[PDB]
Amino acid sequence: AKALIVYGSTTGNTEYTAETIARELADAGYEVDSRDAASVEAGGLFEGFDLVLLGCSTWGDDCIELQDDFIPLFDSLEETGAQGRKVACFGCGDSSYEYFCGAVDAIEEKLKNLGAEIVQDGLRIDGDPRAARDDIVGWAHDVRGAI
Amino acid sequence: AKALIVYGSTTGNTEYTAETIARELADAGYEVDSRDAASVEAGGLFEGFDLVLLGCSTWGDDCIELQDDFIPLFDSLEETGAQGRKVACFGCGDSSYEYFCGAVDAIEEKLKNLGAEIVQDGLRIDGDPRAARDDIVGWAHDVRGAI
Ligand SMILES: Cc1cc2nc3c(=O)[nH]c(=O)nc-3n(C[C@H](O)[C@H](O)[C@H](O)COP(=O)(O)O)c2cc1C
Numbered sequence: 001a002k003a004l005i006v007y008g009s010t011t012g013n014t015e016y017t018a019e020t021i022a023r024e025l026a027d028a029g030y031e032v033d034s035r036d037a038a039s040v041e042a043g044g045l046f047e048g049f050d051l052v053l054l055g056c057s058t059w060g061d062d063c064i065e066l067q068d069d070f071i072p073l074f075d076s077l078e079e080t081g082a083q084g085r086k087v088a089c090f091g092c093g094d095s096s097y098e099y100f101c102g103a104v105d106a107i108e109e110k111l112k113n114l115g116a117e118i119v120q121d122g123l124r125i126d127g128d129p130r131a132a133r134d135d136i137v138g139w140a141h142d143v144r145g146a147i
Numbered sequence: 148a149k150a151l152i153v154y155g156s157t158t159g160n161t162e163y164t165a166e167t168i169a170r171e172l173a174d175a176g177y178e179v180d181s182r183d184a185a186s187v188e189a190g191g192l193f194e195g196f197d198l199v200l201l202g203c204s205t206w207g208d209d210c211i212e213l214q215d216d217f218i219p220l221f222d223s224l225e226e227t228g229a230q231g232r233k234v235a236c237f238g239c240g241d242s243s244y245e246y247f248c249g250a251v252d253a254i255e256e257k258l259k260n261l262g263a264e265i266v267q268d269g270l271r272i273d274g275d276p277r278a279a280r281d282d283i284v285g286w287a288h289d290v291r292g293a294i
C-alpha cells in the first residue's frame with residue numbers, strides 16, 4: 001500500500017498534522033511518501049499511489065483563500081490523475097474566523113467533480129493540532145479503515 | 148408551510164433561480180417569502196419559517212468570495228435562528244473558474260456547524276440558469292420532498 005501525503009502549510013500546523021497522519025500510516029505497514037506542496041508539480045502527481053491525502057490550511061480577508069503553496073496544485077488538480085483515486089482531505093483552521101477550514105471543502109468538491117473517490121469526510125482541526133492528536137490519529141486509522 | 152428564500156445575486160442569475168424555486172413552492176401550496184440579501188438583517192431572520200433556502204453566487208480573484216450582499220448575512224448566520232432549521236442552499240456559478248459554486252459549500256458547512264438540518268445537497272448551476280430550468284424545478288420538488 002503506497003500513500004502520498006501532500007501538504008500546504010504556512011505556520012507548520014498542517015505539516016505537523018501531515019507528519020502525524022504519516023506516522024500512523026507507516027506504523028500500519030503503508031509505504032508513505034510525504035511531500036510539501038511547495039515542491040510538487042501537479043502533472044501526474046498521484047500516479048502509482050493507492051491513497052492520496054491532501055492537507056491545506058485556510059486564510060483570506062473575507063474570502064476563502066487556500067494556503068499559497070497549495071494554490072498551484074489545486075488550480076491544476078484535473079492533471080494529477082484523481083479519476084477513481086482513493087482520497088481524503090484534512091487541514092488546520094480556526095473557528096475565530098468565518099470560513100472554518102474552508103480550503104478542505106473546496107479541495108473535496110473539486111476532487112469529487114474530478115472523479116476521485118473520497119473515502120472519509122475531511123478532517124478539520126481547530127487551533128493547535130498538537131492538542132488534537134487522537135483526532136488526527138483516529139482520522140487516519142478510519143481512512144485506512146475505509147479502504 | 149412557510150418558506151423564506153434569501154438570495155445574493157449580482158447579475159440576476161441566482162435571483163432568477165430564486166424566482167423559479169419560489170414559483171414551484173407557491174405552486175405547491177407553500178407560502179413563500181422571497182427577500183434579496185441586500186435587504187435583510189441576520190438578527191432573527193429565520194424566525195417563523197418552516198423552511199429556509201439560501202442562494203448565493205460566487206466570485207473571487209483566486210479565493211472563494213461570496214456575493215457581496217450575502218457576506219453580511221453569512222458573517223452573522225449564527226444569529227439567524229438556524230439551530231434545527233430545515234434548510235438547503237443553491238447558487239449559480241461557472242465551471243470556467245476554479246471554485247465551482249464555492250459559496251454554496253461555505254454556507255452549507257456553516258449552517259451545519261450551526262445546527263441547521265440541511266435537507267438536500269445544495270443546487271449548483273453552471274452557466275445561464277434559464278437553461279437549467281428543469282434542474283431548479285426538480286431540485287425544489289425534491290427539497291419539498293425531503294420535508
Ligand atoms: C488573515 C487570516 C485569515 C484566516 N482565515 C481563516 C479561515 O477563513 N478559516 C479558518 O478555518 N482559519 C483561518 N485562519 C487561521 C489559520 O488557517 C490557522 O492559523 C492554521 O493553524 C494555519 O495552518 P498553517 O500552519 O498549517 O498553514 C486565518 C488566519 C489569518 C492570519
Ligand SMILES: Cc1cc2nc3c(=O)[nH]c(=O)nc-3n(C[C@H](O)[C@H](O)[C@H](O)COP(=O)(O)O)c2cc1C
Nearest residue numbers: 156157158159160161204205206240241246247248
Ligand atoms: C471575477 C469573477 C470570479 C468568479 N469566480 C467564480 C468562482 O470562483 N466559482 C464559480 O462557480 N463562478 C465564478 N464566477 C462566475 C459567476 O458566479 C457567474 O457569472 C454567476 O452566474 C453569477 O451569478 P449572479 O447573477 O447570481 O450573482 C466568477 C465571475 C467573475 C467575473
